[PDB]
Amino acid sequence: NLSSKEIRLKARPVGMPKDSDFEVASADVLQPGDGEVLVRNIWMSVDPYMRGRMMDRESYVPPFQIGKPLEGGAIGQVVESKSDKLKVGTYVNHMWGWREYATGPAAGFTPVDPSLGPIEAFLGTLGMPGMTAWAGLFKVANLKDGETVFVSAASGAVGSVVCQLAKAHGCYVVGSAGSDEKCKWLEEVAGIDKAINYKTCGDLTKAVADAFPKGIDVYFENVGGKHLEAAINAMRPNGRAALCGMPGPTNLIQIVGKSLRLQGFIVSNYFQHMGEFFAEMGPLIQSGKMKWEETVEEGIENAPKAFLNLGKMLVKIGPD
Amino acid sequence: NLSSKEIRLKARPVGMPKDSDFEVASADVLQPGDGEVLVRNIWMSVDPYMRGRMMDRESYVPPFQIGKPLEGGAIGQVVESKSDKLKVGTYVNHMWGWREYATGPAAGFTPVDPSLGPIEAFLGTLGMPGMTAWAGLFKVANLKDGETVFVSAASGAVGSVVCQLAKAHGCYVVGSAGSDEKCKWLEEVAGIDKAINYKTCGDLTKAVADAFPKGIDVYFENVGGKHLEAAINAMRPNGRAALCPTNLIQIVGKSLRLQGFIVSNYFQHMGEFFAEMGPLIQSGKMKWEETVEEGIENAPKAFLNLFKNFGKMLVKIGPDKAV
Numbered sequence: 001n002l003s004s005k006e007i008r009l010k011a012r013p014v015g016m017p018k019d020s021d022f023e024v025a026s027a028d029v030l031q032p033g034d035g036e037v038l039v040r041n042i043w044m045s046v047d048p049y050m051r052g053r054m055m056d057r058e059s060y061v062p063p064f065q066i067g068k069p070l071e072g073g074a075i076g077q078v079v080e081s082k083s084d085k086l087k088v089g090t091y092v093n094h095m096w097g098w099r100e101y102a103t104g105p106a107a108g109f110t111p112v113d114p115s116l117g118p119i120e121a122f123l124g125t126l127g128m129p130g131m132t133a134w135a136g137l138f139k140v141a142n143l144k145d146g147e148t149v150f151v152s153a154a155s156g157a158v159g160s161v162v163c164q165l166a167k168a169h170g171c172y173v174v175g176s177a178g179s180d181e182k183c184k185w186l187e188e189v190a191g192i193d194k195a196i197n198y199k200t201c202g203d204l205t206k207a208v209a210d211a212f213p214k215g216i217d218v219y220f221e222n223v224g225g226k227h228l229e230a231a232i233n234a235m236r237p238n239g240r241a242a243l244c245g246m247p248g249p250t251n252l253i254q255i256v257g258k259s260l261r262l263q264g265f266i267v268s269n270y271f272q273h274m275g276e277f278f279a280e281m282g283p284l285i286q287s288g289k290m291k292w293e294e295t296v297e298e299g300i301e302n303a304p305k306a307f308l309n310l311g312k313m314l315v316k317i318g319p320d
Numbered sequence: 321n322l323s324s325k326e327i328r329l330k331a332r333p334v335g336m337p338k339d340s341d342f343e344v345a346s347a348d349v350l351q352p353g354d355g356e357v358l359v360r361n362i363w364m365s366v367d368p369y370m371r372g373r374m375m376d377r378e379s380y381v382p383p384f385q386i387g388k389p390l391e392g393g394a395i396g397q398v399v400e401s402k403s404d405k406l407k408v409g410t411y412v413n414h415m416w417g418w419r420e421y422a423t424g425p426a427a428g429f430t431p432v433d434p435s436l437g438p439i440e441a442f443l444g445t446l447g448m449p450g451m452t453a454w455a456g457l458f459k460v461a462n463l464k465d466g467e468t469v470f471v472s473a474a475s476g477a478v479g480s481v482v483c484q485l486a487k488a489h490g491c492y493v494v495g496s497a498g499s500d501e502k503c504k505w506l507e508e509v510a511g512i513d514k515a516i517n518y519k520t521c522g523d524l525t526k527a528v529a530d531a532f533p534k535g536i537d538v539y540f541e542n543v544g545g546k547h548l549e550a551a552i553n554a555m556r557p558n559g560r561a562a563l564c565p566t567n568l569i570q571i572v573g574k575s576l577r578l579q580g581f582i583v584s585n586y587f588q589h590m591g592e593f594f595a596e597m598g599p600l601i602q603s604g605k606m607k608w609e610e611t612v613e614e615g616i617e618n619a620p621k622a623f624l625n626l627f628k629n630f631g632k633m634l635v636k637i638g639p640d641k642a643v
Contacts, residue, residue, distance in 0.1 A: 256541075
């Protein structure tokens with residue numbers, strides 16, 4: 001009886017996506033079958049990786065399909081349930097975003113505890129970005145308490161959580177950003193020891209070296225290029241670099257010299273820690289030690305706009 | 321009561337080391353004090369890293385000293401002992417080479433079990449090169465049986481042991497070398513699946529890709545440069561690189577781990593190491609080449625021959641059985 005507006009891929013984007021590549025459409029709200037649930041979406045997320053999912057190139061993740069509604073992180077509320085394992089009214093996180101309604105088996109919908117924070121934060125700080133930060137910091141880098149931490153693109157969704165998690169563990173934290181406003185935010189809101197503007201600081205190797213008088217223990221990577229060169233130059237013996245984001249560095253020999261470890265990782269391989277993640281992330285949000293910024297568009301029709309604009313980007317669909 | 325010939329550093333080398341930088345001299349054989357031992361040296365090793373120890377540059381290892389006898393891996397036999405923890409007659413590994421006699425506290429002398437193999441192999445296959453290989457393969461790269469292995473500079477002291485250790489664990493092994501003779505040796509003696517000549521093979525990325533139809537699981541590094549690029553290009557998801565480029569992004573894509581290491585941080589595994597290295601030598605699955613010069617006076621010669629074929633360079637000093 002109801003309608004669900006969704007954003008479908010109208011045409012494969014070439015290079016950068018155009019607004020003409022997206023199509024707003026009206027779809028049916030299928031009533032749930034046995035073991036299934038129907039959920040009305042409230043918040044949805046737009047993330048950078050989605051761009052790669054719109055290309056036809058060989059990818060580790062299946063691309064989107066022309067004519068099919070796009071997919072992405074979303075927070076909804078269960079409004080109908082024919083499954084005993086998930087009751088009506090539960091707030092759930094899922095991957096069927098870019099739409100107003102979603103029907104499917106209850107397994108595909110993960111309940112989110114709103115005690116820990118606002119439900120939309122389950123797409124950012126309490127979601128995949130915050131979990132990427134936490135996994136890279138503690139499961140890849142093995143950050144011991146009190147170590148020094150260098151974070152590139154520290155004002156981003158992942159870098160901010162990395163910075164504040166390291167600060168919460170007694171770490172000397174230096175972050176990198178592309179503007180003085182982001183550096184002021186990093187130093188005064190995020191509360192890191194020093195923020196470097198890689199556009200104005202001159203030689204970035206020298207800037208990082210001066211920022212770390214005793215070297216770097218952990219390097220969280222989101223940019224690359226000369227940032228990795230500077231980090232390796234300033235890294236301490238047994239320093240670990242968790243690479244999450246990305247002319248290569250000219251000082252690779254030091255990896256052998258200081259016994260450096262450089263590990264790429266994907267957050268998907270660490271969901272088995274989600275509980276533990278929450279166990280740390282909940283309190284530190286309530287204490288005010290974990291802060292974040294949001295940029296919220298309104299209406300399903302503005303879902304493409306938000307995506308084209310790549311604070312953590314979200315789109316509000318339904319009411320709470 | 322006796323005299324001991326020694327090789328001392330007469331001058332720091334300028335550029336490449338010269339024969340004029342070394343000095344043969346006669347030193348005293350100090351009788352051991354309490355808790356000390358006097359050992360007659362039988363075998364001594366010369367290695368490339370020793371060159372770095374001859375310069376005054378900032379190094380992770382203290383350089384040699386002018387007027388002081390050089391130091392390096394050596395296998396000797398205890399001929400006098402005033403320590404209960406080390407008995408006379410024991411064959412010992414230590415770092416006071418380039419000389420015929422060594423006197424010092426028993427702690428600095430590690431006994432070597434000749435069951436596992438010839439005592440001189442405790443300077444190569446059963447020594448720091450073989451243990452570096454073993455630690456990088458199993459403690460750093462965590463090589464699971466059946467995985468694919470790419471080894472650079474595979475004809476070297478470390479790479480050969482890496483190749484044969486991986487072969488012993490059922491691994492498809494491709495190695496790189498700088499000459500056709502080294503490649504033939506890798507394929508026929510070491511018994512690896514394919515050897516690539518990085519000086520002649522043209523595009524090394526393409527050669528490595530063609531050598532690995534299903535990709536690389538473990539990459540052991542001994543050279544660097546384009547070898548790491550080729551490895552990263554041909555590495556599989558969750559590939560590990562033990563280290564002894566324009567495609568770094570793939571590290572994020574395939575969840576690659578790149579770890580440098582020094583063997584010093586893994587001595588706590590040596591026991592396990594021996595438990596594996598002994599049998600694989602007796603089975604004939606672990607082979608190596610040696611180049612043995614004779615006499616302490618030929619110790620500089622041997623060292624200078626490390627930069628002018630191949631094989632582990634050694635020089636015999638004392639008799640096989642001193643007591």
